[PDB]
Amino acid sequence: KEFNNPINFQDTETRYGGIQNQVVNINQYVQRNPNFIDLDNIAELSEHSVN
Amino acid sequence: QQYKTFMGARVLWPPECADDILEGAIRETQDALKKFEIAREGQKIAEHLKKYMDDHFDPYWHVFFGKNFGCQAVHNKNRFIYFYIEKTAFLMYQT
Amino acid sequence: MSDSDSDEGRVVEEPLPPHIIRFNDMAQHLLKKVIRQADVLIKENPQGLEKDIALNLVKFVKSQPEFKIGDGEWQCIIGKNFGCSLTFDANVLAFFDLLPSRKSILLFKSG
Amino acid sequence: LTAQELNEDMPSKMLEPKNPQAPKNITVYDYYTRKFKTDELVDQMIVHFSMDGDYIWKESNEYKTQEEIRDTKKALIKEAMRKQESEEPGANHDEEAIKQTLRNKFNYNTRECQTINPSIRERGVSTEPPPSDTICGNITQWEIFDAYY
Amino acid sequence: MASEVMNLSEEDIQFCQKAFSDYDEDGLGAIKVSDLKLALENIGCSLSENDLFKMISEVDEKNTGLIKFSDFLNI
Amino acid sequence: RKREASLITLNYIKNRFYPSKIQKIIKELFEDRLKGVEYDPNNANQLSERLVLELREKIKRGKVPRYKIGVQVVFGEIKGQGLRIASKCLWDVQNDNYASYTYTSEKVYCTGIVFGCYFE
Amino acid sequence: MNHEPEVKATDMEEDMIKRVKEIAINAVKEYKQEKQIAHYIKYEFDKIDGYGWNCIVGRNFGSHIIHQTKKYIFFKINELCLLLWKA
Amino acid sequence: TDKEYISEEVQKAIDDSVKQVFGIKDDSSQVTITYNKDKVNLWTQQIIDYTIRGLNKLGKHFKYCVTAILQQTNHAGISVQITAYQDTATDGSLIQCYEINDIYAIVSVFAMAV
Amino acid sequence: HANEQIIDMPENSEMKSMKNDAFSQAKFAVENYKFENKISSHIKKFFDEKYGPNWHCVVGKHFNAYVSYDSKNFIFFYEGQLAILLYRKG
């Protein structure tokens, strides 16, 4: 008939995730003389009508 | 348009407001009504709810509750809560 | 050496005003110093023009020695609601909003 | 975009790719339009952590622009240091001093601009409809005739 | 469970009088009609609108239960 | 409320608040486990996995036994490098909810994402 | 309908001020988002006025920022304030 | 088998999304992609659409949750741990790490019994 | 018959039309639309074009509400039997 949940559901399995190591410098120059960042102080507004 | 009942209060089944905040607001409104009736000195209970929202949520909350009314408003994402308790519908949108 | 508890604290001694950081591309020591000055400045003139508050804040950061990262002149813009994108010197931009004031404060240097 | 059939002829339901938590609709006012604009379609994508960083790889297009900015600033600094050194006799001015010296009151002007904001106010308004009263009326042929008479 | 409360007796008694008057049935419950029975017997108010006004102002109402007694307590 | 009773029959749901209750619980747990902000060594990477295991047990404790909880914890070093993580999960709309909390220290950023799916 | 914006105060050339107003009208209609409007003005100005430029659009804000002489223009449209300065 | 979660099927779905966005696979391929702030936002949304669509096409009755994280060209220490609470016989969780030239990304797929 | 109304609008500052427009718009919109939800949308749209965005108006025959509004941008009036409240926040 309709759905039921009597069967045990107690098993947990965990699989690790990793990234292979490489030289930290990696032919790259840290940062820039000028850094450009966009910051918004106004939260997005959504209009909903309820009657 | 599909109304749903949660925690003893009828509100839109798809909740515009955040699940955490919406539950707190509904509980606070029910407690306020238990103390002050909507029929007598109804203006005072609405003012108390608005001040309460500012203390635990982002400021400039707008609260409108009436037995019969129709309104359309612009609100911030997850800042609109509409629910019905008994025959009274309470709608609050955070700006 | 202190009232109630002797020798105070390394943590107890310094208190920071409540604030929200939209973005913090700056040294932590520099940001903490700016937040304390901004909170005190707003407290000194509550319900006052934002431009007046901004001018005092710009003078304070410029006046303090060893707080200059060079390049463009230090310039801070304060508005309750504003949207902008500005080119800035690397690690010279601090953005924060005071919870009590509820006004966003933007400080950065552009060359 | 698939539909799962519930056992024992239950009302059918299906799963969807769109994230439910994300706002149903996002509306942004457009000055050119001059009226509120509402977009039913939304990105509906959730990111736990978003990070933007100033990391550039060698010979990048962006890196070339950064080099031009450094060269232009250096050229102005080089011209300013050389001109001051050339104008004066045995000038000992430091490069850092020349950069500070390059900035001038006429050269750089700072103006503070703010936008007028109305003070936020809190007001409570209560509306209550006109009082209604119960009325009972009984009409009979004799009563109608009596008024008529 | 009282807690040191004198209060008037003249009125407190009146309510009990009119109450048991119509509630004499001993049904244990009270309806919206019974509340008006009293005022309808003696003729306290002109129309039910009066009693209904104050009562309604109290909070709410229904069909019948027992809390209706409030009508007299407030009457 | 026959329709409300009918709604229980199609799906029980057991929709306990999960948007911030899990987020408040994970945020409190993350601060204690993180300890010193400065530590970011290679030996600590093994320790990061231990923090994730403790987090899953706490989610079950906070009124989530009926739901199935999937939690992913990412530990990374930020030197101004920019990386954005977005998670999309297909679930019965309004029958499931997820809580995401992001904590960023001066040199270490830790993000925890918890996914709950109703099952029976 | 959107009328031409009125500048409260500016330090720009007669040829230059017309270009800023022309760019501003196109930018407002193209992007609904306030931040997007600011982003478009800075990029368009970079080709015409060089590498250093800054654009901020705030409905209500007050601030003072150092700017190169003759490169600072501030114009307010109906119900919106846009401020752009160079270096 | 026909309606049973398979680790091999999940891996191929993630592979299709990575190949579809920028992979011509090994030889006879000339692709050089550099992470950009504007491009990264588009890639996460586009990659998620392909992984969900790819999983869905051969998908059984399983609840699917996908999380995508893009590393900023390595040069930092990042470790990702995945914990799943589900019946072991009913479901399995697989995390795949992908190296794609300049940009490194990690894709995790969660399987829930239905 | 709108015996008592609350008026908080600028006078002789060239913003005098906002009060006049609200009374005129409410009478025209309420009669034609004849819907509580529709009246709020129409009044908000007309005011938004003329005086910019961030305007919220709620129309109900009987209702109780408390809200924070920008000074001199809130007007409360009764159009016939119906009561219309419009204010600007943000």
Tab-separated table of N, CA and C in Angstrom, chain B residues 32-75:
chain	number	residue	atom	x	y	z
B	32	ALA	N	1.589	37.439	22.177
B	32	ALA	CA	1.057	38.813	22.317
B	32	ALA	C	-0.473	38.771	22.340
B	33	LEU	N	-1.089	37.983	21.449
B	33	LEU	CA	-2.573	37.906	21.428
B	33	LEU	C	-3.079	37.298	22.739
B	34	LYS	N	-2.398	36.262	23.234
B	34	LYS	CA	-2.803	35.587	24.496
B	34	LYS	C	-2.933	36.639	25.603
B	35	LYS	N	-2.079	37.665	25.556
B	35	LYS	CA	-2.039	38.750	26.573
B	35	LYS	C	-3.021	39.866	26.200
B	36	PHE	N	-2.873	40.450	25.006
B	36	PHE	CA	-3.775	41.554	24.574
B	36	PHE	C	-4.663	41.091	23.414
B	37	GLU	N	-5.986	41.197	23.575
B	37	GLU	CA	-6.954	40.764	22.530
B	37	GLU	C	-6.897	41.705	21.322
B	38	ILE	N	-7.156	41.179	20.124
B	38	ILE	CA	-7.161	42.007	18.880
B	38	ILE	C	-8.323	43.014	18.913
B	39	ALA	N	-9.487	42.586	19.411
B	39	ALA	CA	-10.724	43.408	19.422
B	39	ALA	C	-10.584	44.683	20.264
B	40	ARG	N	-9.978	44.605	21.452
B	40	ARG	CA	-9.862	45.808	22.327
B	40	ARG	C	-8.395	46.241	22.423
B	41	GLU	N	-8.121	47.526	22.159
B	41	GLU	CA	-6.740	48.085	22.167
B	41	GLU	C	-5.862	47.296	21.186
B	42	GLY	N	-6.401	47.028	19.991
B	42	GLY	CA	-5.711	46.285	18.916
B	42	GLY	C	-4.482	47.018	18.405
B	43	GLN	N	-4.512	48.353	18.427
B	43	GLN	CA	-3.366	49.162	17.934
B	43	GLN	C	-2.112	48.860	18.764
B	44	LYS	N	-2.269	48.709	20.082
B	44	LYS	CA	-1.116	48.471	20.995
B	44	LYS	C	-0.389	47.160	20.668
B	45	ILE	N	-1.119	46.070	20.408
B	45	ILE	CA	-0.452	44.761	20.135
B	45	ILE	C	0.393	44.836	18.854
B	46	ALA	N	-0.104	45.505	17.809
B	46	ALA	CA	0.653	45.617	16.539
B	46	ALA	C	1.958	46.380	16.778
B	47	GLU	N	1.897	47.459	17.562
B	47	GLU	CA	3.098	48.287	17.855
B	47	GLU	C	4.125	47.445	18.615
B	48	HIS	N	3.666	46.638	19.576
B	48	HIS	CA	4.579	45.792	20.389
B	48	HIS	C	5.310	44.789	19.489
B	49	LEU	N	4.595	44.190	18.535
B	49	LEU	CA	5.195	43.190	17.611
B	49	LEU	C	6.278	43.858	16.757
B	50	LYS	N	6.012	45.075	16.274
B	50	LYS	CA	6.975	45.799	15.402
B	50	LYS	C	8.276	46.060	16.172
B	51	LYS	N	8.169	46.506	17.426
B	51	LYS	CA	9.367	46.783	18.264
B	51	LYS	C	10.126	45.473	18.513
B	52	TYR	N	9.392	44.386	18.762
B	52	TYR	CA	10.005	43.061	19.043
B	52	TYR	C	10.825	42.598	17.835
B	53	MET	N	10.304	42.816	16.625
B	53	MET	CA	11.005	42.380	15.388
B	53	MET	C	12.355	43.095	15.279
B	54	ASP	N	12.391	44.392	15.583
B	54	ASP	CA	13.648	45.182	15.483
B	54	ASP	C	14.704	44.638	16.454
B	55	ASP	N	14.280	44.207	17.644
B	55	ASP	CA	15.241	43.686	18.653
B	55	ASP	C	15.937	42.405	18.169
B	56	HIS	N	15.198	41.460	17.576
B	56	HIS	CA	15.811	40.163	17.169
B	56	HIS	C	16.007	40.023	15.652
B	57	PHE	N	15.654	41.034	14.853
B	57	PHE	CA	15.793	40.925	13.374
B	57	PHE	C	16.282	42.259	12.792
B	58	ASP	N	16.604	42.273	11.498
B	58	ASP	CA	17.102	43.509	10.832
B	58	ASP	C	16.041	44.607	10.978
B	59	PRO	N	16.433	45.881	11.198
B	59	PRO	CA	15.483	46.979	11.451
B	59	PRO	C	14.611	47.440	10.271
B	60	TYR	N	13.631	48.304	10.582
B	60	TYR	CA	12.634	48.903	9.651
B	60	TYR	C	11.567	47.890	9.207
B	61	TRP	N	11.233	46.936	10.080
B	61	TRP	CA	10.162	45.941	9.798
B	61	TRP	C	8.827	46.678	9.657
B	62	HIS	N	7.985	46.253	8.710
B	62	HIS	CA	6.634	46.850	8.528
B	62	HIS	C	5.601	45.799	8.941
B	63	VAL	N	4.706	46.116	9.881
B	63	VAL	CA	3.700	45.101	10.319
B	63	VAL	C	2.281	45.638	10.108
B	64	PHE	N	1.465	44.902	9.346
B	64	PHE	CA	0.044	45.279	9.116
B	64	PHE	C	-0.847	44.063	9.389
B	65	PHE	N	-1.752	44.160	10.366
B	65	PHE	CA	-2.667	43.020	10.636
B	65	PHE	C	-4.111	43.527	10.732
B	66	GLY	N	-5.005	42.946	9.932
B	66	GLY	CA	-6.431	43.325	9.936
B	66	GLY	C	-7.315	42.131	9.627
B	67	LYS	N	-8.580	42.171	10.053
B	67	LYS	CA	-9.502	41.038	9.775
B	67	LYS	C	-9.688	40.912	8.257
B	68	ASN	N	-9.915	42.038	7.573
B	68	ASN	CA	-10.082	42.020	6.093
B	68	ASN	C	-9.272	43.157	5.457
B	69	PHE	N	-8.288	42.822	4.618
B	69	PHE	CA	-7.494	43.859	3.907
B	69	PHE	C	-6.785	43.235	2.699
B	70	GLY	N	-6.430	44.068	1.715
B	70	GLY	CA	-5.694	43.610	0.519
B	70	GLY	C	-4.493	44.505	0.266
B	71	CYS	N	-3.292	43.935	0.140
B	71	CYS	CA	-2.100	44.792	-0.099
B	71	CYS	C	-1.032	44.079	-0.934
B	72	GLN	N	-0.240	44.872	-1.666
B	72	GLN	CA	0.906	44.390	-2.482
B	72	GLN	C	2.114	45.247	-2.080
B	73	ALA	N	3.245	44.625	-1.733
B	73	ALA	CA	4.410	45.429	-1.292
B	73	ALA	C	5.728	44.837	-1.798
B	74	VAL	N	6.778	45.665	-1.811
B	74	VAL	CA	8.146	45.243	-2.237
B	74	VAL	C	8.942	44.977	-0.955
B	75	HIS	N	9.520	43.779	-0.833
B	75	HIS	CA	10.259	43.391	0.396
B	75	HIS	C	11.595	42.733	0.029
